[PDB]
Ligand binder design. Structure first.
Ligand SMILES: [Zn+2]
Ligand SMILES: [Zn+2]
Ligand SMILES: [Zn+2]
Ligand SMILES: [Zn+2]
Lengths: 183, 181, 183, 181
């Protein structure tokens, strides 16, 4: 009967999409990876993103991050854990990009802050893929969402990110970071 | 903290999550089109590293599934941009086992390839430095490969199942051998 | 003034394209990588392949392998040399694909045989990229060549591979392997 | 056997091969659009491993170049399929240093970004496990980053040049600092 909502969660056995949502079982494409990333040059993910947009003709993509997250912790620490270092170097660039903002916060609160920046940045990445641009620019309906789940509090009434167009992607992304920067 | 890594297809019809009779939080999931493990795919090899090294998983399960979008698309003849690149890896497998699959009926192929695919992905899994090393340092790691027959409801052990490189060769070679009955 | 011929050689300080060819300096796009591969899911290469076909509008791609080659040797040996193992696992699949044929040859002669299979297989890969298919199928001129260079003998008057269309790619590829199999 | 690894752009105008005044056979070349080293790029990281570990190279040079196809295409606004994905990494760099590049003239950006790019690729190079490890086992490895100004004929030391992680920080930070004169 076909799925209508793509979820991109973290491999960290978190965002049991199934369970966190509770919508219609069978209408949820899922992809999971360490720190729930959308990297410009990742076939794996983009391939999913493609199948979901072009083929299954989906109109929603949630990227969902979470707090107390292994990728983020791994990303912030130094242990060279092999391949995963490469993968997380992308997250470390995000940390550098917002170093100033993060660069003044109880270090405890930094992991959770970075979890949030990240969800914004991946939506921003997602939104700049040819896949998605093409789709919008050809008049197809597609909405993007960035949410952060916490095991204690549920979903944070945060600067979510929300993008239904190239123009809205921008505002949203900016607003998101703008909003996170206040302290 | 979880003992299994599940590697499923993005196609939505395999919710291992309950299927099994195990748990969540004991389940560390990665899902991608056609449920592949590609030699040079950082996305997935990354999931497999965190699994094997950080969490110290004991079982990695690759789960294929019948009438699968990915599999069908692979044999379809029509460009879908990026997804085609990703699916060429499954075409290579298709060609590999061509004779076998010619000796077969057009609509029955779908399913066969689904099986073969699982076999082949496990062989890929088991040749990764990651896995070959868990093994050499004597970590307990078993690799399992199943197809979910969405039609009959039940899963199905394909009996690829490996615990070492030697046990990897035997299952793989035996599986391919068996799928030319 | 623009280039008209893409060369894909081996990173093994071999196929100094420049020098091996001697055509018009400035009209040679080059990419090099270990064992001179064209992998289905490699952005790096495909990106070059794209720039060259779509943008610079090239009409020739040589993939050039060579004999006594580090990638091939590495591929055939067992030392786990880290990342490169992953990369070469692709070459090892080619070895498995032609195991029977290789599987009866003075083991010395195997490395050179595999060097040749490889050049065929990469052309075959190249030829099945959307990039190239799209190009042909839209009536653009594009020729593909697979040659093997030897330091002692120069270019082997071998089953080269040669493909100007989807249909010719096939014949050529088959003919190539067919031809290599005789002993 | 060779002592240098050269990492150039595919754009054809940088034939390091003679440019230098060194040699071939002492030169192990990898060329790709916009002369990038991406964190998760197996193609290139592979060249860099073979270089550093197998051949035991002493110098890795990343060479950018003025009016570069890749750089221009990055700032162009027009989809070119796959190449766009690859070029988003250079857009991210562009944005990163946006203010600097706004404070600048439309046609002069081209060149600046070319410089910045080199700076940033070297920083990428120097954060790879591969390189960070050569260093910890005390191998001699220096990383250099140059722009070839095709117009004036001459190369140009950008004076990113690193021999350790600490020496990597200093050059990088100093370079960016200097390119906001
Ligand atoms: Zn996580
Ligand atoms: Zn499927
Ligand atoms: Zn070579
Ligand atoms: Zn260039």
């Amino acid at each position: 009967q076909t799925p209508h909502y793509l979820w991109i969660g973290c491999s960290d056995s978190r965002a049991p999409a199934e369970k966190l949502t509770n919508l219609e079982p069978g209408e949820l494409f899922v992809h999971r990876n360490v720190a729930n990333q959308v990297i410009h040059t990742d076939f794996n993910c983009l391939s999913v993103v493609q199948y979901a947009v072009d083929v299954l003709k989906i109109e929603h993509i949630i990227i969902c991050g979470h707090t107390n997250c292994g990728g983020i912790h791994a990303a912030m620490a130094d242990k060279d854990l092999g391949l995963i270092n490469n993968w997380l170097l992308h997250i470390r660039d995000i940390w550098f990009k917002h170093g100033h903002l993060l660069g003044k916060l109880s270090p405890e609160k930094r992991a959770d802050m970075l979890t949030k920046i990240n969800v914004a940045e991946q939506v921003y990445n997602l939104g700049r893929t040819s896949i998605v641009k093409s789709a919008w620019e050809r008049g197809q309906k597609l909405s993007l969402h960035g949410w952060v789940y916490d095991v204690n509090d549920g979903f944070l009434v945060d600067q979510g990110v929300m993008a239904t167009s190239r123009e809205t992607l921008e505002i949203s992304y900016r607003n998101a970071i703008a909003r996170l920067s206040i302290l």
